[PDB]
């Protein structure tokens, strides 16, 4: 049955969980089984658990558990009930130094007397249902009993041996357990019903949400919940954001432990921890092991956590509901998580036993992490610090037995690692380790996903620095002198707060001047306190400290005087006795000038007449003629005769001369900047000045080297930059010069070509219309609401006023421009829906938007088009425009503020966009319906084919309008619309974006993405400036005004006011640039819609590239319009012989009136019958000539066709001969 047994694990009804431990192992499934169910009385060894599965009315039952060594000193368990009284059948149990009953019997053959020493020899009730299961499990000196509840007892034992007496019950009555098993409870209802257990295999462990399988490299597998893995923090916890921090998240081993079992284990920071790691174990000694639990009752037991320091000191962890270990008793009379618990560490050594206070235990402890270097965290807060730990012991107490096996409580052997952390709601949700060079680049910025582009990357340096030290100065006769400066004082007096004497001498004198080239300071303290020790501190008001002068500092002169000296910087020495007199010693005055005459040394340098020493062609830390730096020194062929050390015009050291031999050595940095080509979420290529790197292929561009994994040429550049383009596979190649559409220049005669077989193509263009109006409160942003700071701010006059003035002026101008810009006609809107609009052959389904009666307050809603859905949802980070937060609830203050309120509390308020996406979509639909609105009323809803025909006739008169003539154009338009939709649907899939560049969908969507990102990026960059401390005491103005007196505080706060105001001014400057840029785009859109959408354009190439523009339609876009310019492109050209004009009988010249009209001979009758046709020069539309198309000219030319009055009517059928007709 087993329903009741798993029902004893109190679990919520609709939850599915994973079981573990020494559970009953299934009647038949697996090897398992082997229920005895008969009085055979078997014997086994190494058993870790036994069970009884069926109570057939209360049959007899006997248990004998002992040690395999058969020791007499150990405790033996023997449970005996040879009774069938059910309720009265109270089972006899004797946990004693007890008869190790070998086979069977109340006493039987054994050793040890019955009652030599007993811990429990009472009677226990043993009545339960037939399907009830009772069992006992022992492991790690912990014993668990399943008698109607999951009991738990700590008991030092070794119970690998068991002997039983059995009575038959249903064929499966009692059993042993040797190894842990698992189960899957698909619970659906409370009680014994709706449980639906099933057997298991090693795959169930990963199914638990709070445990994971460690990757072989030690990283957390993706998708982990991080339910309780709080990020560690010494001072404060971030509530929402992204942080790159050094945290112990690189786990070596994860020990999933069932909640019903406690853990007693020795953990050392010097050895790989034991236990069965769920994932791929790493044989590395932990430095930070993280414990995950469910309830505080596990830890509250005294001595649960014992920390052993490297010195051997032990810290016993004690929790109690009192406060004074020294003056109160900590024997706990309370439990069940009642009242706050005050937890301490009891220092245990036979010198002095003191208690160190951790913190008030929170009402719910979920993760405690203990690391070496002496640091312990509770719920992600570093309450207490210690010295270097080396070992930790854990003595836990199972769980609360009221909700168990809801997975496992786990402990993780982790190592510190710098990882990018995404946290929202003060809880982790995803992580990214900063080890992979791609991951290193990602952690260089703060982002998990990076758009395609070139990102700066630093050349990898030597991981082991081991840098030799270089030091070069002028040659001179070597000479070293020690300057010691001995200070003599006697402090303390009475009670340690008095003084007696104080004096100092410099080499036995009150003043000294260094004459030898080398010198080394060595301060000595001849100070004695009558009360104890003297604490010494050193001041500094010089470019150097006493410890720093020995670091190869160079001077022309260096004189030290204990008294005031002219032009001498001051350094003071402070002496602190045990009780803190706080007085200072004599001030040290250092008069010095820059030069190479003398140099401080840490030790008298070797060498004769020259002390310089340096290492060639190795990344080294150098001090060259006072120029401290790190770089590579290489001998070069330069022969600069003058000078000693050479520097660029910017003051950077370039090369220095050996002077002794005349050789010069160039100084270059150890590492050089590199550009990493990051496309398709991977590093595919690196632009570097180095000749080689960790890539199998390397191509040398004229200006730089390029390393990648693909040496082939790149012909389809996914990403372009400067003169080069990079493919998605890492290939590099020059961008080919795309050949544009050919345009035929008009001419009066000779061979010409008339384009034909026109097919239309849609070219997409996006133009931004407006920006989100941002109004920042300058006063509250700068002063942070501090009244006393506003008085100082007022001294800056209009610097604060002009910011908001310009911001509001720009916002109002943009608002009024776009408001007067958007004109909407309701009649056009009527014809803009699928039911009304009728595109015969033209598929406008992807372009039009449906309209339904909205139940929301009745007002009808017109859903935006499918293309608009694709453009908005897939790009907008918030999904919808209504997500823009409102400030009505922002001042409530009853909930923790989010990012919007965080920036609003600093005076930054974001006004809603001037026009909603709904209004923009209705405007686009209005334009689409108006391009087919043939009359002032709705009764003139022309079919789109008629509008297309009219627009075709506008640019070239159609002489043969057949059905297929429009059908081919309609088919081409439908195909191009399908291509556009496929391109919008997804990137580089279902629509090959190999055709990429300007006037394409990819460029438009990249522009939309950058537009929607820049507005947030600027605001975040503004808000982060508040964190900066502009060389003041602190970033908090009230903190400054509290630490300092009013005079100095005003000076200090003025530093940040200038810093914040300059940062605020920088934001305005970039927004005005954005406003200026968007104004030009908006002005073009007004020109674009009038000259392309509301009417076809005679301007060549204005509406979406070259070709004959037939029409264009507009779709709503984020903060702008997406123009879809439909343009005709020819597929073939007809070659005909143009005619300049006609001259009949050499007496009347006759030429074409229309400049954009040609006359030619075509087809079979071009030369066999000499037939003449006229047509537009834009499209091939042959038409017989008419007298209205011809004009008379006073004179002829040679190029004109030579005809006679009889032949002319053949050329011009409409011509009539007045003389011939009248004379008949
Ligand atoms: C809360 O505040 C506590 C301080 O009370 C911080 O504790 C520090 O934790 C860091 C680790 O995050 C400790 O840094 C480690 O120091 C070890 C020993 O330091 C000696 O050796 C280094 C290197 O030679 C010397 O520079 C140093 O002066 C000491 O002489 C190092 O061995 C560790 O090396 C690890 O990092 C390096 C990279 O730097 C890796 O290459 C190594 O492989 C290794 O992984 C490490 O540098 C620091 O000592 C702790 N300080 C104290 C006083 O204990 C907590 O980190 C802080 N917590 C938070 C969340 O802020
Ligand atoms: C865990 O339990 C859930 C809940 O279902 C309940 O518990 C099961 C153990 C059974 O005893 C169910 O009778 C009981 O309602 C299981 O979800 C259930 O899965 C089954 C398929 O295995 C669903 O049956 C099908 O459902 C589809 C869609 O409704 C129908 O078209 C089919 O004709 C067929 O009926 C069943 O609907 C579904 N329960 C509910 C409430 O939707 C679940 O499979 C089980 N195991 C795991 C691993 O979760
Ligand atoms: C038709 O088109 C023009 C029109 O000329 C007219 O028709 C001719 C048949 C003659 O009867 C012309 O007298 C008449 O105006 C013809 O173009 C003509 O081409 C000839 C040469 O092929 C030109 O003569 C030249 O004149 C220059 C001096 O200007 C001399 O130096 C040359 O040696 C040569 O003789 C003549 O000027 C020119 N006419 C005009 C008006 O430019 C054309 O040849 C004729 N036939 C065809 C097939 O087009
Ligand atoms: C690990 O933790 C367990 C759980 O607290 C510790 O067991 C506890 O040890 C104390 C000290 O002996 C026991 O107190 C004594 O109990 C006996 C009855 O057994 C009583 O007669 C004494 O007067 C005294 O109160 C306590 O009962 C016992 N808890 C349990 C559940 O058995 C254990 O000592 C810890 N071990 C280490 C190494 O830290
Ligand atoms: C220990 O883990 C369990 C789950 O893994 C959690 O404790 C349990 O929390 C649930 C609700 O979160 C409690 O459910 C309640 O049960 C009562 C009894 O029927 C019911 O009337 C309520 O409506 C509610 O459903 C459940 O009792 C509780 N189990 C306990 C406390 O044993 C929690 O994550 C951890 N417990 C603690 C105290 O932190
Ligand atoms: C700058 O150029 C000078 C001159 O070329 C370099 O001086 C050279 O230094 C080396 C090492 O000190 C001298 O080697 C000699 O070796 C003998 C035998 O072991 C030893 O007895 C000498 O005391 C000396 O060490 C070398 O003669 C000397 N060159 C001279 C004097 O012309 C110098 O190393 C170069 N670099 C710097 C940073 O000064
Ligand atoms: C004009 O464009 C519309 C765009 O909606 C075309 O209508 C849709 O055409 C597809 C052809 O693949 C139909 O097939 C499939 O339908 C399933 C279920 O609706 C859908 O999940 C697929 O993604 C795919 O769309 C689709 O049923 C049909 N109707 C829709 C999407 O509502 C139409 O065929 C084009 N040509 C005309 C109207 O002549
Ligand atoms: C701190 O605790 C450790 C162990 O908890 C003590 O080390 C034990 O010392 C006894 C000495 O009689 C040995 O028999 C044990 O084997 C040691 N245990 C371990 C794990 O090594 C240590 O003495 C304690 N130190 C103080 C100052 O209390
Ligand atoms: C270009 O114009 C010439 C005359 O202006 C056309 O005449 C061709 O002239 C060549 C030269 O001998 C002959 O071989 C061809 O047979 C002529 N073609 C015709 C149709 O008369 C020529 O056809 C025009 N087109 C091209 C491509 O040259
Ligand atoms: C402590 O560890 C020293 C280093 O050896 C290794 O240490 C860690 C990194 C693990 O890899 C461990 O398995 C190795 O032993 C030892 O030299 C030293 O003896 C160790 N000390 C003690 C007391 O075990
Ligand atoms: C800690 O909590 C105790 C509550 O326990 C109750 O009182 C004791 C005396 C026993 O009778 C026990 O059975 C009860 O449940 C308080 O009595 C005690 O004062 C608290 N500690 C402090 C310092 O206030
Ligand atoms: C237990 O013993 C009492 C006393 O004789 C009796 O009345 C009762 O029925 C017994 N119960 C069972 C379950 O045997
Ligand atoms: C410290 O100065 C006192 C003052 O004369 C002197 O007697 C004593 O010897 C000095 N001690 C040292 C270590 O210099
Ligand atoms: C300075 O102290 C050093 C030892 O630190 C000693 O060798 C040297 O002789 C002392 N010089 C003087 C002038 O006291
Ligand atoms: C210096 O001259 C040598 C010999 O002519 C030559 O091998 C070397 O490449 C030259 N180096 C530079 C930097 O000019
Ligand atoms: C790749 O480009 C280079 C530079 O133009 C050219 O020499 C080479 O032939 C190209 N590769 C192939 C396979 O044509
Ligand atoms: C291209 O135009 C020529 C001449 O007008 C015509 O014969 C041919 O069929 C056209 N091509 C197609 C694919 O219709
Ligand atoms: C994409 O374009 C090709 C050629 O222009 C066309 O055959 C295909 O039908 C288009 N795809 C869609 C979905 O219209």
Can you give a write-up of this model?
The protein is built from 17 helices and 67 strands. With 1224 residues, the chain is an alpha+beta fold. Strands 2, 4, 5, 6, 7, 8 and 12 form a 7-stranded antiparallel beta sheet that branches. It has 7 domains: 23-179, Jelly Rolls, CATH 2.60.120; 210-450, no CATH class; 461-476 and 609-670, no CATH class; 479-604, Immunoglobulin-like, CATH 2.60.40.3130; 673-734, no CATH class; 763-1095 and 1103-1125, no CATH class; 1132-1222, no CATH class. The radius of gyration is 45 Å and the shape is extended. It starts with a helix and ends with a helix. The structure holds a molecule of 5 linked components (NAG-NAG-BMA-MAN-MAN), a molecule of 4 linked components (NAG-NAG-BMA-FUC) (2 copies), a molecule of 3 linked components (NAG-NAG-BMA) (4 copies), a molecule of 2 linked components (NAG-NAG) (2 copies), a molecule of 2 linked components (NAG-FUC) (2 copies) and 2-acetamido-2-deoxy-beta-D-glucopyranose (7 copies). The PDB classes it as viral protein. Keywords: pedv, Spike, Glycoprotein, viral protein.
How many separate structural domains? 7
Shape: extended
Tally of DSSP β-strands: 67
* SS field, number of helical segments: 17
> What ligands can be seen in this structure?
a molecule of 5 linked components (NAG-NAG-BMA-MAN-MAN), a molecule of 4 linked components (NAG-NAG-BMA-FUC), a molecule of 3 linked components (NAG-NAG-BMA), a molecule of 2 linked components (NAG-NAG), a molecule of 2 linked components (NAG-FUC), 2-acetamido-2-deoxy-beta-D-glucopyranose
State which percent range the strand residues make up. Answer: 25-35%
Class of secondary structure makeup: alpha+beta
Straight-line N-to-C gap: 124 Å
Measured as a percent range, the helix fraction is 10-25%
Keywords: Coiled coil, Glycoprotein, Host membrane, Host-virus interaction, Membrane, Signal, Transmembrane, Transmembrane helix, Viral attachment to host cell, Viral envelope protein, Virion, Virulence, Virus entry into host cell
Coiled coil: 1009-1053
GO cellular component, one term: viral envelope
Region (Fusion peptide): 928-948
